[PDB]
Specification:
The structure is a monomer. 30% of the residues lie in helices and 22% in strands. The protein is α/β, with parallel strands linked by helices. Among the domains are: 189 residues, 3-Layer(aba) Sandwich (Rossmann fold), CATH 3.40.50; 160 residues, Chloramphenicol acetyltransferase-like domain (Chloramphenicol Acetyltransferase). The strands form 13 sheets. Strands 2-1-3-4-6-7 form a six-stranded mixed sheet, covered by helices on one side. A five-stranded mixed sheet has the order 19-20-21-22-23. The structure holds diphosphomethylphosphonic acid adenosyl ester, the ligand *P(=O)(O)OCC(C)(C)[C@@H](O)C(=O)NCCC(=O)NCCNC(C)=O and valine. The site of valine has 10 residues, from α13. Keywords: Antibiotic biosynthesis, Ligase, Multifunctional enzyme, Phosphopantetheine, Phosphoprotein, Repeat.
Length: 1186
């Protein structure tokens, strides 16, 4: 007995505890709003129970309810006070539990009533942890409420300690809610957070260690560490006497030589930063670098003095008057934050940018380099790269701090890989950095000298090399000091990783909102740590855009513009530039993904795929490959056709003896040479007549005669369009005939007779008070009347919009769609015998506006999912839930109106309206199709279709009996969901395999499902499973809203003695007749099998398999189907094509399968699918489930 005030997040939050309190005869008042000190909520209140409440109570209310305010907080206080306690308990690795406590003047600090610990498994997602913690604290309350009111609980004080978090603290981590505990802590180690020496301080130290060792070697001219230091001191004294101060730039224009090394060190010791200028650069680049730089002094000699055009003061390094007699180390004037050098990135003059690197950047890299590669003074290093390229900083600075010797590559032998190898073998060169392009050609040479070869700068593809040296792949932008990650290439990889970060460096993968990405999810690569340079010279606005302060973490980081993702082992995978993404026939492609498939060819050693644009603007791919002899164009398409769909196969192929290289040793992509070769223009009146129809169905211009219909985007839907468009020219073609003759050259043989030319449009009906319903509408109506409160046939979708979209523009667009489509203004009524349809001229759309937290969205949607009265229009409800970061549009509909294709139409028209576009009126109406089809049921064509099912469904029908629990006594619909993602690479292989063997992706997946079912049913030779078709019988219905879908049983045979490919063809043979006779209402198919809708099982099949194609619009691709805890069948498998992969959803009945069984079945499906794709000619009996 009492009166309790329940303050919680939303209406249904804490259902169990309210029901328990009410069962004890307490009166509960639920509220989520703020409580005023004087209000109706407060008067006559015994207890106040709060659970995830969103507001703080006034000091006066906490006073008037001393010892009467109980709070349910899902953490082990004092750990994780405040917001998101479960998440922070996992991320911070704190003790875990739930606490019921009193509310005091000080928040989340009142005396504990009861506390208990809780455990989270490694494989649980953060969402499961959240729900588990809530369940535990609610059960704890129910268990102890009696021992609270009666006073059996003695409160005790919280210990001082723990943690605290606020609302916005979680913003950076918003993408992590579906990641497991193990995966979250792995990410934490990779994401969560001193040098006080300059480089010349470290070099001067290295000299005192090895003063007599060789430092530099140039054509028999030698210089020891002590000689090098003294000469540098001589020039440095003079330079500082000329006014060299810290952060001052000094230009150097010299050829690789002893003087270059002496000049670089002299500028450091003097106190300034050097700006290297390669004398071999074009004149305009030299002039640009000298102008953009603030250097007033230039070190050069006579041969290059003229190239400067007298732009600054010149100091001749050959003149003895530039060297002071003093050879003593200068006194230090440099801080580690002072510039050490400035190097320019690629680009035209004015675009190219000067990158400012600081002493501490360089020291950090050199200290990591020496131990990582084990550099001892006995090592011989090569100075290969131009000294205007930061690859030379690697060559020079890392080895001078390890006592090793630098060897000045002689000009006549850098671009001759053969002589270079000879110089390295003869001289004993052990370590060197070679850019990717040059390194891949150096691998051919027989070398015995090198211990380690480091490459980088471009995508490394070849690793087969003659030699015993270790191969390393390094990555990094000039902006972050040479390299930030390193990887030891140990074996072949389709994509060679770029490795793990170096000392005091972290790599973050962020999304477009700068939010952390889970491990394995691709995003933009950001860099944090000691490698970040100062920025771009004379360019503060560009610096602020690329060197950002993160708005949540406050940390400084560099936006690289590269795409990448972490691998499970901590290594990183480069995925290309974010700009190089090009679209071809409506597919976002990374051309780099095609190359490794050309590499696998036995006769190809190097390859590079590019994107180009014709004068028209059309995109098209070209493939360059290196091989001894030219490979036929056809043999290449067939080779690539094993793993890639046609849109990723280059239109052209170019054979070359070798790739040209740039100065920096990268492949010169701009220097490669500049309707495909397999086109066979039509030469016939019929040939040309079909090449035009195919072009319109496939949406491709200038179609050829040897072009395979499926390889170029054809599917079941587009095969229907082809047939109906050939009936437009009196040419009759059947469904199965297209798959035997999938090209115009072959198909033309069967198109001679020009009869059966019946052009019949769908006819509009005269106005009537009432209209006839279709066959499927009658079935749906009768089902709904069996339980009018059931939501099992509601259809719920959501769409995430940005906060910048206007809620009211969305409402208006939906209201216009109610006006556009009579389906949204249709009602259903039972007039004695018949089920009848009425149409209203106008209908009012229910549109609800709400606000809430992201964590509450699904709970708020579930409260809105209610039955539809089929006699009332519109059969659609909608609303918008605004959170802190987005607006979630939801709409609920009934299956009698919205089917799969109807959703696609609704999404396309909604996208147009939000874009301020005008739509042409809808020409046909569903009610006219219903009258046309009801009459078609009296024709002879219908008699023949039903005759197919009478024959097939006679007698012995297989019984697929999966291992379940004891079935309930009647039909249940309680369901849950599990998901399996097939990545793009495997999805492409599946797609390529299907087309190559005259199969659709659907036929290929249906066969895998059938083998899967068979394996679970004691390798049964036959299986039965349902599927669905769009059911758009009349071609004038493809833009209407309504229910057209028809259900079909499939009797399939699996021959475990035959190969996968053989079973694939046998599934096609059984599917096509079923599609040819698909237009019989499912109720008549149940008659033909003498089965009725009764019992605890669904009549003909327990397993349903359905599949949808890729989305037609950006909006549709952002639509998510929400399951309301319903399972129409024992088990449904749905395959959706999303983001170049397959999302496979297993919807199952919870009374028949528990989570343990489903998790095993999903694991077995994946394993079976991977064996199939890789084992086409393998016998099915050799595929195993575990
Ligand atoms: N191992 C590696 N693998 C793949 N790409 C790499 C790589 N190492 C470096 N890169 C790429 O090269 C870029 C940095 O090259 P930098 O020389 O520092 C500027 P750049 O000279 O203007 O390059 P550019 O001429 O290719 O445009 C990186 O962003 C990355 O895209
Ligand atoms: P082909 O490419 O082998 O496809 C065969 C199908 C799938 C039978 C094809 O004819 C077809 O009917 N595609 C549309 C199927 C469809 O509508 N799936 C979604 C139905 N789902 C809902 C919720 O309505
Ligand atoms: C090693 C260095 C040259 C770096 N990888 C770059 O490409 O700029």
């Amino acid at each position: 007995m009492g009166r309790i005030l329940f303050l919680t997040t939303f209406m249904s939050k804490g259902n169990k505890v309210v029901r328990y309190l009410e069962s004890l005869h307490h009166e509960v008042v639920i509220s989520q709003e703020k409580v005023h000190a004087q209000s109706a909520n407060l008067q006559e209140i015994d207890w106040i129970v709060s659970y995830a409440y969103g507001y703080i109570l006034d000091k006066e209310i906490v006073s008037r309810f001393r010892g009467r305010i109980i709070n349910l907080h899902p953490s082990l206080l004092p750990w994780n006070k405040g917001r998101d306690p479960v998440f922070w308990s996992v991320w911070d690795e704190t003790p875990k539990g739930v606490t019921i406590h009193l509310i005091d003047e000080h928040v989340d600090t009142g005396d504990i009533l009861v506390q208990e610990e809780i455990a989270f498994a490694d494989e649980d997602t953060l969402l499961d942890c959240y729900n588990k913690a809530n369940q535990a604290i609610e059960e704890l309350f129910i268990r102890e409420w009696e021992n609270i009111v009666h006073g059996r609980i003695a409160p005790y004080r919280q210990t001082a300690g723990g943690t605290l978090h606020f609302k916005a603290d979680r913003d950076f981590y918003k993408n992590l809610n579906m990641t497991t505990v193990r995966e979250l802590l792995a990410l934490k180690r990779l994401s969560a957070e001193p040098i006080d020496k300059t480089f010349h301080q470290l070099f001067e130290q290295q000299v005192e260690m090895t003063p007599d060792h060789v430092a530099v070697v140039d054509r028999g001219q030698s210089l020891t560490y002590k000689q090098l230091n003294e000469r540098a001191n001589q020039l440095a004294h003079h330079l500082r006497g000329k006014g060299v101060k810290p952060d001052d730039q000094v230009a150097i224009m010299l050829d690789k030589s002893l003087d270059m090394i002496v000049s670089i060190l002299a500028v450091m010791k003097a106190g300034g930063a050097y700006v290297p200028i390669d004398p071999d650069y074009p004149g305009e680049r030299i002039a640009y670098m000298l102008a953009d730089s603030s250097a007033a002094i230039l070190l050069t000699n006579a041969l290059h003095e003229e190239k400067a055009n007298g732009a600054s003061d010149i100091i001749d390094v050959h003149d003895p008057d530039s060297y002071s007699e003093n050879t003593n180390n200068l006194p230090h004037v440099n801080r580690p934050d002072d510039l050490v050098y400035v190097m320019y990135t690629s680009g035209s003059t004015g675009l190219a940018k000067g990158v400012m690197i600081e002493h501490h950047n360089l020291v950090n890299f050199c200290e990591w380099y020496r131990p990582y590669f084990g550099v001892t003074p006995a090592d011989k290093a090569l100075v290969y790269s131009s000294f205007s390229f930061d690859g030379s900083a690697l060559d020079i600075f890392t080895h001078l701090l390890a006592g090793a010797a630098l060897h000045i590559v002689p000009s006549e032998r850098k671009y001759d890989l053969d002589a270079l190898n000879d110089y390295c073998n003869q001289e004993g060169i052990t370590i060197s950095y070679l850019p990717t392009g040059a390194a891949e050609q150096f691998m051919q040479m027989d070398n015995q000298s090198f211990r380690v070869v480091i490459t980088g700068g471009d995508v490394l593809k070849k690793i087969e090399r003659n030699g015993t040296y270790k191969l390393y792949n390094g990555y990094g932008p000039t902006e972050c000091t040479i390299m930030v990650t390193m990887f030891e290439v140990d074996k072949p990889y389709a994509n060679i990783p770029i490795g793990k970060p170096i000392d005091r460096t972290r790599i973050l993968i962020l999304d477009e909102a700068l939010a952390l990405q889970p491990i394995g999810v691709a995003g933009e690569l950001f860099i944090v740590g000691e490698g970040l340079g100062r920025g771009y010279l004379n360019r503060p606005e560009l610096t602020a855009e690329k060197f950002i302060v993160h708005p949540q973490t406050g940390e400084r980081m560099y936006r690289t513009g590269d795409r990448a993702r972490f691998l499970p082992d901590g290594n990183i995978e480069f995925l290309g530039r974010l700009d190089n993404l090009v679209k071809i026939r409506g597919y976002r492609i990374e051309p780099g993904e095609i190359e490794p498939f050309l590499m696998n060819h036995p006769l190809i050693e190097l390859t590079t795929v590019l994107a180009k644009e014709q004068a028209d603007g059309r995109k098209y791919l070209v493939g360059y490959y290196v091989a001894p002899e030219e490979i036929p164009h056809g043999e290449l398409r067939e080779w690539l056709g094993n793993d890639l769909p046609d849109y990723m196969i280059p239109t052209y192929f170019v054979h070359m003896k070798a790739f040209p290289l740039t100065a920096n040793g990268k492949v010169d992509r701009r220097a490669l040479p500049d309707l495909g070769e397999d086109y066979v223009a039509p030469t016939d009146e019929l040939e040309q007549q079909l090449a035009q129809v195919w072009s319109h169905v496939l949406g491709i211009p200038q179609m050829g005669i040897d072009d395979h219909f499926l390889e170029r985007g054809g599917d079941s839907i587009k095969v229907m369009q082809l047939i109906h468009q050939l009936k437009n020219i009196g040419l009759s073609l059947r469904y199965d005939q297209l798959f035997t003759h999938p090209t115009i050259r072959q198909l033309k043989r069967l198109l001679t007779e020009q009869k059966q030319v019946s052009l019949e449009p769908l006819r509009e009906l005269d106005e009537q008070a009432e209209y006839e319903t279709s066959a499927v509408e009658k079935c749906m109506y009768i089902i709904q009347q069996q339980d009018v409160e059931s939501i099992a046939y509601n259809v719920v979708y959501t769409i995430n919009f940005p906060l910048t979209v206007d809620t009211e523009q969305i409402r208006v667009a939906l209201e216009q769609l109610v006006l556009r489509h009579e389906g949204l203004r249709s009602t259903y009524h039972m007039r004695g015998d018949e089920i009848v349809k009425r149409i209203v001229p106008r209908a009012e759309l229910s549109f609800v506006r709400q606000t809430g937290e992201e964590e509450s969205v699904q709970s708020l949607l579930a409260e809105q999912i209610k039955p539809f009265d089929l006699a009332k229009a519109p059969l659609l409800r909608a609303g918008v839930i605004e959170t802190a970061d987005k607006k979630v549009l939801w709409f609920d509909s009934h299956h009698i109106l919205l089917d799969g294709l109807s959703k696609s139409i609704l999404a396309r028209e909604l996208q147009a309206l939000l874009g301020q576009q005008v739509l042409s009126p809808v020409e046909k109406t569903y009610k006219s199709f219903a009258r046309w089809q009801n009459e078609w049921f009296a024709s002879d064509e219908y008699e023949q279709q039903i005759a197919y099912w009478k024959t097939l469904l006679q007698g012995e029908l297989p019984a697929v009996q999966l291992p379940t629990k004891k079935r309930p006594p009647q039909l249940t619909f309680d369901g849950a969901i599990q998901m399996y993602r097939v990545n793009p690479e495997i999805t492409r292989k599946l797609k390529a395999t299907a087309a190559k063997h005259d199969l659709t992706l659907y036929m290929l997946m249906l066969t895998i499902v059938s083998i899967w079912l068979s394996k679970m049913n004691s390798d049964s030779n036959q299986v039965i499973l349902g599927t669905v078709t769009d059911g758009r019988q009349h071609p004038d219905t493809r833009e209407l809203l309504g229910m057209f879908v028809n259900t079909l049983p499939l009797l399939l045979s699996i021959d475990h003695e035959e190969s996968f490919l053989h079973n694939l063809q046998q599934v096609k043979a059984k599917l096509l007749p079923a599609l040819q006779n698909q237009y019989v209402p499912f109720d008549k198919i149940l008659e033909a099998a003498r089965v009725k809708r009764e019992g605890n099982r669904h009549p003909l099949f327990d397993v349903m398999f359905m599949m949808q194609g890729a989305p037609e619009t950006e909006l549709e691709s952002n639509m998510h189907h929400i399951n309301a805890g319903i399972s129409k069948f024992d088990l449904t498998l749905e395959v959706l094509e999303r983001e170049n992969g397959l999302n496979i959803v297993f919807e199952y009945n919870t009374h028949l399968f528990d989570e343990g069984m489903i998790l095993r079945m999903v694991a077995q499906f994946e394993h079976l699918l991977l064996q199939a794709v890789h084992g086409l000619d393998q016998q099915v009996k050799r595929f195993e489930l575990v």
